[PDB]
Amino acid sequence: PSAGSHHNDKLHFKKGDTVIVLSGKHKGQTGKVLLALPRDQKVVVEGVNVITKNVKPSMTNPQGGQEQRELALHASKVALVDPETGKATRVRKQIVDGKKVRVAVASGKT
Amino acid sequence: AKHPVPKKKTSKSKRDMRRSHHALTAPNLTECPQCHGKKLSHHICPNCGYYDGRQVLA
Amino acid sequence: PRAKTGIVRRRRHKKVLKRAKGFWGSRSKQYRNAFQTLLNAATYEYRDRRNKKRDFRRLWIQRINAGARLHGMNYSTFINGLKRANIDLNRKVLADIAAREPEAFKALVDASRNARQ
RNA sequence: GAAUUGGCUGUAAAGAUGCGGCCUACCCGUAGCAGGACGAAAAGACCCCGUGGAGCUUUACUAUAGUCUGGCAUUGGGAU
RNA sequence: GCGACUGUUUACCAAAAUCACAGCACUCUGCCAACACGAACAGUGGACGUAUAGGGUGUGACGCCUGCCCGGUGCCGGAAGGUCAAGUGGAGCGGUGCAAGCUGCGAAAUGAAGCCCCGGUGAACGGCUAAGGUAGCGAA
RNA sequence: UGAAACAUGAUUGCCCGUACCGCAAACCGACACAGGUGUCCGAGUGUCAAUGCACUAAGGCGCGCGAGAGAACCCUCGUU
RNA sequence: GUAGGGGAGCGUUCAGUCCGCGGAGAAGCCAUACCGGAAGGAGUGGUGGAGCCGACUGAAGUGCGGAUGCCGGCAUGAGUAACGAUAAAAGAAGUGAGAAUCUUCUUCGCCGUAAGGACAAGGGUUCCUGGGGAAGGGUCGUCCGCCCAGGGAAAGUCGGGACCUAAGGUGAGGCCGAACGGCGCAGCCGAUGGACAGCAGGUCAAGAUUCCUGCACCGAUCAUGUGGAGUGAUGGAGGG
RNA sequence: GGUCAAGAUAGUAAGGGUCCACGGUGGAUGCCCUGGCGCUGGAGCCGAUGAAGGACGCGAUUACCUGCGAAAAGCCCCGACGAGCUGGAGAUACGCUUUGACUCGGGGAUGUCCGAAUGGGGAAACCCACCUCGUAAGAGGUAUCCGCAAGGAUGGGAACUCAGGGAACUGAAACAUCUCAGUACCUGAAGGAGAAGAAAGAGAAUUCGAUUCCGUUAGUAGCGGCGAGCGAACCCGGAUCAGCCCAAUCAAGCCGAAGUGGCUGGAAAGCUACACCUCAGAAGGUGAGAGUCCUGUAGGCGAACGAGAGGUCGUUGUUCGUGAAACGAUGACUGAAUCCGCGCGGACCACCGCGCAAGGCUAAAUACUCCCAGUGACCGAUAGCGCAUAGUACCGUGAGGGAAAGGUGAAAAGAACCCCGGGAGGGGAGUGAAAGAGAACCUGAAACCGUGGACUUACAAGCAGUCAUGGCACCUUAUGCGUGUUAUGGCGUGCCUAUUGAAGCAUGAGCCGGCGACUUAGACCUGACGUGCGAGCUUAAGUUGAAAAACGGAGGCGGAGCGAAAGCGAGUCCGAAUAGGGCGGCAUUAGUACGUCGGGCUAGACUCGAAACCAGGUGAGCUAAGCAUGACCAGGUUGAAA
Ligand SMILES: [Mg+2]
Ligand SMILES: [Mg+2]
Ligand SMILES: [Mg+2]
Ligand SMILES: [Mg+2]
Ligand SMILES: [Mg+2]
Ligand SMILES: [Mg+2]
Ligand SMILES: [Mg+2]
Ligand SMILES: [Mg+2]
């Protein structure tokens, strides 16, 4: 069953960054990342939402209706943005934390 | 062996000319004089238990 | 490379299968049998043309003299007569003339006796 | 094999429900009988064939375990 | 009638007149026996026995019995002579070289068992030309 | 010199099996199969005797389709 | 016009190349009264939900009704024969969505050298409790030897082992063998046999010479006393 | 109207038939891949510091698998890596993570029990001992064979290598030789390769000069019941190329250019309009089709520290099957020399010639393929491996045999709540582009079951149709021809096989779907067609390049025939010269290489099927017997010897 390898269990972003859902529905919509599932290529960003009905049987006093939860996506959102529009990434270097490397587009932040 | 045995498969047709006699006869239900539900002539009304008075228990 | 028969056979079959219509039972629902029925089918088809020709002239000759004899002739005679008169030379439609136009048919009738004796 | 699966005579590769001629016969079932369907079952176990097979014979051919036998080693010393 | 008897047998068409049997007979076997299993001068069984024992074959309680034919085959014994293997034995023939020599072929006689040959043996094959059916029984 | 043996105290006691079916829907028979399975116990009354035969304790069970009907024919019986 | 020879072509996949086509929708499927001399081709509509026609050339696991062909699916026989020993069953009452078929009671009938009881082997949890209700149970099932979960099995002395040996197995060192290997004394393994310490009761839902209760026995190790001296083998004999 | 009579005729369908519609069943078909096959190349041993392959275990919950192993889904360390992780599992809880987890590389430490298994027993994973070190817990040793001693050996490897032993079917249309074969199988030893190897050689040139492999020579020499059939070597081309010694760069990994708008859509990477990158337009993914969104790619970087003697008898091998038959080899008897020495050059001799045996080790080119990567006019689920994974289920006492099985959607958003039902199931609602995708979820053929409708059917003899006509219905390629259905008439002996002859009471077959049979190879022979050269025409092995093909003449075919052969030659064999046979010239006349094809030959040879034969092993847990040790036979009767 192959699975999220075509890419390379590599999330071109962090579970905290902000991103624009390019492609698919919710195009351009933005939000902070929350779940970064690298293996499966799953991303949970406050953007897209869903109203799911919790299957809570003898779940101590059921009262289960329909929650509002976020439903994960793939590489259907382009990691990080600064010109307010999607943007590749390329010009790195280091900080006072040369113990690290950054990234940037036409501009140079993230 | 299985001695007598049939000479040929029988038509879907033939096989039906046959069954032209297996149709159930629906009961001839009557309507109980009291609780008015339908009943079987000469038997007790399963819904009220009557047969003029009440024979079977409720 | 492998090379199934796929779709190639279903079709060959539907072709025949669909030729059989009011073919009774199996003969119109089972390939093999339906098909096979169509070989005998060949036999009849082909031979029936070279043959309805035989059947039709018969219908014609039958009527041509149930009118011929309606006056006092009879095919045998009658025909040789119109013959005796190269003049006359229908034979084809003659029956019909004898079936629809009695007025006419009589004509040709007497015409022959008048070329006969 | 599929069936819209009669009787008598005849014909047919020589014992026909589907060929011929005549006759009989409204449609569908149930319980029963076993004459027919050269009914089932087993690619006949008889018979012939196959330069097929196999078991068994023997003074068929051939070889061989085994076995007797002469020479040669292990094998020597003393006499006629 | 058959078989003496108890017994045994064709698991899945034969229970029997089949087989076995006690009894009889022939013969083999001297003991690491004859005989048999085994690649094997290993081992072992016969037998931790030893010829009134063990092997093989046939016959089948008991009874009265059991004849005639050894030409043929076999088995035992005899055994002059005939034939017969390897080998021993080297003449005679031929090769090559100049030659010494080196090399092909090949007897006579001699040489084991066996085969031919002589006799024998039937509860050996077997027959009733090697003889021709003693008793007993007999369309069983 | 403080032995072996007895006694009176004490401490000590390992591993495996021990449920249930087990002449049977729990094992061998493809099936909760009319078969096959070794051993032991196996009551009473009556009948020479007995682990026979009849009835029956203890105990176990009526066998995992059922109801009617009362024909032909088939099976297993009774009388003639 | 049969065996056979010769000719021209249809179609299927794969490959190279050309023209392309497709989510307002490919292939495949399905319907059809069109087209071509045939093999066959097209148009239109429906289905479908993603790949795909046509043309030239190249390579083929390339074309099917037969083979008592192979695999799979579904029919006929037909609701037929059967429901597995002719030891029978009846009522009441209860549970339940639903019971001839489960539970309770009261009767009946069958076995009783057994169709009772205890083991062995073999099987494993099938045992007990509470649930279950697909499939299995030749029919129902609310029930089960079936499904799920939890629980249950207790030994110094009963069997076995830490003891013994039989057939047989194995076997240092030995005898043989083309290899692998074949035999073989002692020794060892090896029960079905030898040897050896306990009985009576109680009682979990489910264990019992195993746990408890009562009383007992065996070996071992130590202490105390007695004793007052030998103790006595992988060997002999007796015996088993 | 009526009544009476005589005529005629329709209507109802219990059930059936044909056609249509709609469904169920079932799984073909198409598309797809999480899975296979082949070839190329790479790589190529593991193990008493205890393997291979297993038993029992470890998890909060764990049955299967996975990884491990009581230090148990993991423990240290070095590196790499930067948000995540908390195995497959799709679940909850607990938690762990820059004093950088996790994951990937690379070394350590732990590693119960069995297994060569080796403390002893043992019917594998169990049962029992002993000695030593010792806190007891716990540690360790306790096997046989070589060696003072270190240290080596026992085991396991798909195929490949050598060796010891070595079939038969089958062919020869039977069969004993011979063939099939020294193949199959058994066994021993070994390695990554082996084997072989440095000349008492081959050859006829007084040449070559270890071994091995490919080409060729050649199907020539020759072997052969001279039958079937078997079949060399030298030379020459090429891979590769050494002889030496005794005794007297690949793995982790990091960096890595270039786009927007509008349109269609449920969603665009599609359309359209402008733009960019390009030593990276190989490829996969993203709600449909991707140079510029992601991963990558060309290209660059890139680690602590990790890899790279003679003979005689009996026989036999080489083409060598007894033949005139050498030489090699060896079981048995024998038994030499040594330079004015020894072996051989196919009996044998001389002469001529090549070489020096009885000691040894040796790269490299060669083989195979368990494992790995890449590729494929390979498959794509009755195909492909048996397995989209299982040697499992299942069958067998055992050796052994051995399955089938794929697909919701882009994403669970996997259906809250309500209706009928105990449930199963279903209907709504809601999600979704779609439920005309709902979890017994892509397409969904056919047989087969069913519901509804249309036209029909209850004096009829029927291979089931076909031709003709009428009736009824309908008319999207279709109202003017038809489509469907039907009544009556004529005519009419299923299909295949095998046959002199089949409806045949002769074979085969229940129905449908899918699977299912004249092929492949050899520098082989022979011919048709076509192409290139052409009196000449070609390469084979290999070589070097390869998102390509050139190089390579060793060799082969034309070019002279005739004859047993010497050999002669457009002539030549018969014969002593005159006749002829075969050949040239004939009036004329070429081929050869590659391809497609017809056919031949040798291989399993169109497919399927044998009874049987041979090899190695599995079985006395049934049954026939033996051996050791145990068990069992109510009750009654009779009445022997003594
Ligand atoms: Mg009958
Ligand atoms: Mg007798
Ligand atoms: Mg008797
Ligand atoms: Mg009854
Ligand atoms: Mg078929
Ligand atoms: Mg499919
Ligand atoms: Mg697999
Ligand atoms: Mg026949």
Curated annotation (Swiss-Prot), chain A:
One of its GO terms (biological process) is translation. Keywords: Ribonucleoprotein, Ribosomal protein, RNA-binding, rRNA-binding. GO terms for molecular function: rRNA binding; structural constituent of ribosome. One of its GO terms (cellular component) is cytosolic large ribosomal subunit. The keyword rRNA-binding applies. It holds the Pfam family ribosomal_L24. Part of the 50S ribosomal subunit. Contacts trigger factor when it is bound to the ribosome. Belongs to the universal ribosomal protein uL24 family. One of two assembly initiator proteins, it binds directly to the 5'-end of the 23S rRNA, where it nucleates assembly of the 50S subunit. NCBIfam families: rplX_bact. This is Large ribosomal subunit protein uL24. The lineage of its organism: Bacteria, Thermotogati, Deinococcota, Deinococci, Deinococcales.
Swiss-Prot record, chain B:
Zn(2+) binds at residues 32, 35, 45, 48. Part of the 50S ribosomal subunit. Contacts proteins L17 and L22. A zinc finger (C4-type) spans 32-48. Keywords: Metal-binding, Ribonucleoprotein, Ribosomal protein, RNA-binding, rRNA-binding, Zinc, Zinc-finger. Its cofactor is Zn(2+). Residues 1-33 are annotated as: Disordered. The keyword Transcription does not apply. Belongs to the bacterial ribosomal protein bL32 family. This is Large ribosomal subunit protein bL32. The gene is rpmF. GO terms for molecular function: rRNA binding; structural constituent of ribosome; zinc ion binding. Binds 1 zinc ion per subunit. Residues 1-22 have a biased composition (Basic residues). It comes from Deinococcus radiodurans (strain ATCC 13939 / DSM 20539 / JCM 16871 / CCUG 27074 / LMG 4051 / NBRC 15346 / NCIMB 9279 / VKM B-1422 / R1). GO terms for biological process: translation. Forms a cluster with L17 and L22, and with L22, a pair of 'tweezers' that hold together all the domains of the 23S rRNA. Interacts with the antibiotic troleandomycin which blocks the peptide exit tunnel. The keyword Metal-binding applies. GO terms for cellular component: large ribosomal subunit. It holds the Pfam family Ribosomal_L32p.
UniProtKB/Swiss-Prot annotation, chain C:
Keywords: Ribonucleoprotein, Ribosomal protein, RNA-binding, rRNA-binding. It comes from the Bacteria. Gene3D superfamilies: 6.10.160.10, Ribosomal protein L20 (1.10.1900.20). One of its GO terms (biological process) is translation. Disulfide bonds: none annotated. One of its GO terms (molecular function) is rRNA binding. InterPro entries: Ribosomal_bL20, RIBOSOMAL_L20_CS, Ribosomal_protein_bL20_C. PANTHER family: 39S RIBOSOMAL PROTEIN L20 (PTHR10986). Belongs to the bacterial ribosomal protein bL20 family. Part of the 50S ribosomal subunit. Contacts proteins L13 and L21. NCBIfam families: rplT_bact. Binds directly to 23S rRNA, probably serving to organize its structure. This is Large ribosomal subunit protein bL20. It comes from Deinococcus radiodurans (strain ATCC 13939 / DSM 20539 / JCM 16871 / CCUG 27074 / LMG 4051 / NBRC 15346 / NCIMB 9279 / VKM B-1422 / R1).
